[PDB]
Design a binder for these strands. Sequence first.
RNA 1: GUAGGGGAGCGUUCAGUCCGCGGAGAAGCCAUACCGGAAGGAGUGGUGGAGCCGACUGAAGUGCGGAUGCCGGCAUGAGUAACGAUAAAAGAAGUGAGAAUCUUCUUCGCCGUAAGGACAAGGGUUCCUGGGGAAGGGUCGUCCGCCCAGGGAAAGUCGGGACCUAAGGUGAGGCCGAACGGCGCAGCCGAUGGACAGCAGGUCAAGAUUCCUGCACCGAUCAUGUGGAGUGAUGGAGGG
RNA 2: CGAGCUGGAGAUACGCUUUGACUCGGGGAUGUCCGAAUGGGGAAACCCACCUCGUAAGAGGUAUCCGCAAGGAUGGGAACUCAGGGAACUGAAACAUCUCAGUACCUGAAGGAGAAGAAAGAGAAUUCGAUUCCGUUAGUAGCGGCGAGCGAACCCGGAUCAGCCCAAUCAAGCCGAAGUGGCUGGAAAGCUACACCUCAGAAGGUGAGAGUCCUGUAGGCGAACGAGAGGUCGUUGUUCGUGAAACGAUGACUGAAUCCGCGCGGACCACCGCGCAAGGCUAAAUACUCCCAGUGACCGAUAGCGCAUAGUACCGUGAGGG
Lengths: 66, 72, 110, 93
Amino acid sequence: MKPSEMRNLQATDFAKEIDARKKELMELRFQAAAGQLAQPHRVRQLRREVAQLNTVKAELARKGEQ
Amino acid sequence: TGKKNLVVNSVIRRGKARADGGVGRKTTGITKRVQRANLHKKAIRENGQVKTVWLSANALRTLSKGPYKGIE
Amino acid sequence: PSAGSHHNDKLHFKKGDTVIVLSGKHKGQTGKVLLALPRDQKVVVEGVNVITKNVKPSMTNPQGGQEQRELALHASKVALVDPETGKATRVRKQIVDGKKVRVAVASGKT
Amino acid sequence: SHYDILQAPVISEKAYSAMERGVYSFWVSPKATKTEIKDAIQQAFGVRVIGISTMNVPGKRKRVGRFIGQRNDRKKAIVRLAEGQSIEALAGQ
RNA sequence: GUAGGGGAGCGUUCAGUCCGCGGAGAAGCCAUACCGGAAGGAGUGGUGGAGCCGACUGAAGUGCGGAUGCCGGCAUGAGUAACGAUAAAAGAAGUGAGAAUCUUCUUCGCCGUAAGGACAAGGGUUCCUGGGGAAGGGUCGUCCGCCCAGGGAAAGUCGGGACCUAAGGUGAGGCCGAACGGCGCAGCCGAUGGACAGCAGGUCAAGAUUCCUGCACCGAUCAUGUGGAGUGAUGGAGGG
RNA sequence: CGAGCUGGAGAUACGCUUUGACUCGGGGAUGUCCGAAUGGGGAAACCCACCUCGUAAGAGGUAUCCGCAAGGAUGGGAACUCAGGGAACUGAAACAUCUCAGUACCUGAAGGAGAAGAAAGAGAAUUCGAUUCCGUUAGUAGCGGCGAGCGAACCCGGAUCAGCCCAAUCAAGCCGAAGUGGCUGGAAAGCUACACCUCAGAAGGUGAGAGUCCUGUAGGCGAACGAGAGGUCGUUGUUCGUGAAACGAUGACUGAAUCCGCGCGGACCACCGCGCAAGGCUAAAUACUCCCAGUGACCGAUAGCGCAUAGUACCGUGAGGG
């Protein structure tokens, strides 16, 4: 979710950890406008996650070459 | 504008009358006072390589002789 | 519109302590705090109460009547007490939870 | 990715009526050219696209409040799968 | 006793000081046949709902009927004149709290090179459906081009762009210029013009040479066969 | 920091939090399209290309000027600074001089500040000894259709006070003393009776007027890590509008010396006297104020900013007004 057990993963897994949350996030958003969004929060989380999902990956961008 | 230094920009021009009397007439009344500007010219010269550029008498003269950074 | 900052969005107490309401009505009355609204200086201590009439229009078979509910207050109740009476607070320190500090008056608890 | 861009499904009745004939239509993103969009969809629902139609739509409302309102601009797009009818079941709705 | 000079005071706000006053009730407001030489002050009662009298002293955005003054409120004119083309309307029926004024039907009359249809510009959602009924609609309004909410607009070929140029605009190198900047070949931007591949129907409450249906055409890229060899420029000509 | 949070909005639902949220200090990473804007086009936020990296997606480069090369420049700033250009009304109870003014305005450049600066000076005592600013001198000297009217400097006191070099503590933040009863009340911090604190009785809030209830205050603490040359002609500046009028300054023409040398000391000469120009950089005191804090015989909603917020409604094709 952010602790090492985040970075602990690969570069693609990172990708994998992203391109999927916005595959959920979508069906979610659909649901929404389709009526039934019972998990408003779920959205936020999912979102939040992808931020870090990259935020972290950016942290590598300077750590291992400078 | 010249080579060595800029130029143009000038000043006003008066015109008096009753001008000059017994060592002094009564005086010199003025009737003008306006404003003017004074220019110059050019000739092709160059440094580094070929050019043309403007050249002010008082420079083409000074260059015609000893050159200074610039060559006639 | 200024508001509840005169103090300093700081509640001198927990939404869990017990407090006596000095001044105003419900003087000396006490009860466990419930709502800790700092910004506004809002307190919900099982003390004060009013029987409100809920506005439930086309709210599935209205039947709206008069609910008994607590009405919030300000710095009108002197936080916590042990001598059973309003008591300032002062002699802090720490516990076996040096990771924190307490409070206390003439005595020393909370 | 793929799953990106589509913004939501077009509810409405016609649209839904269009679906009973295998035409799907959701709101994509404004700047979402035909090709890309034709792409996205396919690969987000596994299927191809024979035809595609798309065009912009403003909004400007309010209820009250000296705050007039403001557009909201959309881009409902419509796609026609091949005889390989249906998209999941997010159709039979 | 007019201009004008001189004298003594009244009142407002702010300020320092003294005495103080107030939720059993301050300021402000409203009433009043008291007091003082005037400016003015007091008492009592009503309203009001919190700050406030008196005294000395200091400083003042300090006192008003006038300026065709300024802002704002409200009058008179006066249930007055008007209701915006002299193309007219009538009946029945319906809906509704309530309709001359809405909807339906049956007649009437007015436009008909238009008062019909289709664009362009221009305006936007004013379109369609269900609601509404404050304000707008010169009257009514159950209705609307008005308020709310939702839907609606679909193009390889129609217009425009990824093509072209005119006027004109811009413009490396270039020509001038106190500054700013003024001009200027090519090149570029620029229609209103050139160039260019579909057509007949059907049909949402609401779209259509765009969706569907039938059948068609253009270019582009690859596969195959045919071929059996050149292809042919930011340059020439022809042509447009 | 320590237990609430879920922006103004206040409403409901979902939830997040002491595995330390929220919020506050301080660095990062993301940062679409336009705008100097700069790949090219363009009626701003739109339209089209190209090269390279590349599994698609996706990333980056593609403007002009200086410079090998790094690296610098193009824009934006309320006022303040200097620079190039530079009004009229108005005054002179008319007007040409002069005044208004080198102001208003335009443009250029720049910084937090500028500009100016180390004596070819001022000036008379054979003195002072960079520049700037305040007082003063003095409205004196002087200029002036000698009208209207304009107006120095030296000396002296004070702020600040360097000359050097070329060319041959403040922000987050934590700690913080001292009251009860009765009474009036709808509510007391008011009345009253006894009590305490006081290097904190500044202030705000509490159902009315609060030292001792809250937030604070005096006073104490307080962070990883974050700040601190001469001349002639045309003219002009300085009080200097031709006047006997010097010197500076420059468009135009000309055109020197150099120690038994050069410049100046208001024409001019001699004498006496002060200084050495044609290369440069330079704190400090100075100005202003978009922003910040504190204060206010300042306002308190026709005041006060135009705005209790809005450059919005609304008026204009637009500048602009509001």
